[PDB]
Design a protein around this ligand. Structure first.
Ligand SMILES: CN1CCN(C(=O)c2cccc(CN3c4cccc5c4C(=Cc4cccnc43)N(C)C5=O)c2)CC1
Length: 125
């Protein structure tokens, strides 16, 4: 069964726009989105659809690139590091829920490498 997806707005949280956050949307997220292995990560895990009734019994901090994209579009984050943490949570969730060598894990491994390549150098303020 599915919990509510992670919030993409929160009026009690302050918003911010920075050059680095703009880059995380325009270049990092939007390039990863087009990778051949991006599709499992473009929306919250639908445990009912995918017949993964254990998914949210295991994964307590779910995250995906659809949520990240909406957060970036909504200026939800304070800084680039907060957004980067959401990407890292997404990848770690995949490693936690699965096991080494699974096709889904090979996909996450490739995307994580591309992600790190792209965030190695960010624009300055
Ligand atoms: C039963 N077979 C299925 C094939 N298989 C895989 O390796 C495998 C590879 C790619 C996609 C899937 C199915 N799926 C999904 C499944 C499992 C874990 C996870 C997922 C996901 C996301 C996901 C998204 C859309 C559709 N489908 C998903 N995310 C984040 C996950 O952590 C499974 C394992 C054995």
């Amino acid at each position: 069964m599915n919990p509510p997806p992670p919030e993409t707005s929160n009026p009690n949280k302050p918003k911010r726009q920075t050059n680095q956050l703009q880059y995380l949307l325009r270049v990092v997220l939007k390039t990863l989105w087009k990778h051949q292995f991006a599709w499992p990560f473009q929306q919250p895990v639908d445990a009912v659809k995918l017949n993964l009734p254990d998914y949210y019994k295991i994964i307590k901090t779910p995250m995906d690139m659809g949520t990240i994209k909406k957060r970036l579009e909504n200026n939800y984050y304070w800084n680039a590091q907060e957004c980067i943490q959401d990407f890292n949570t997404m990848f770690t969730n995949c490693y936690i829920y699965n096991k080494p060598g699974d096709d889904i894990v090979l996909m996450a491994e490739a995307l994580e490498k591309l992600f790190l390549q792209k965030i190695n150098e960010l624009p300055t303020e």
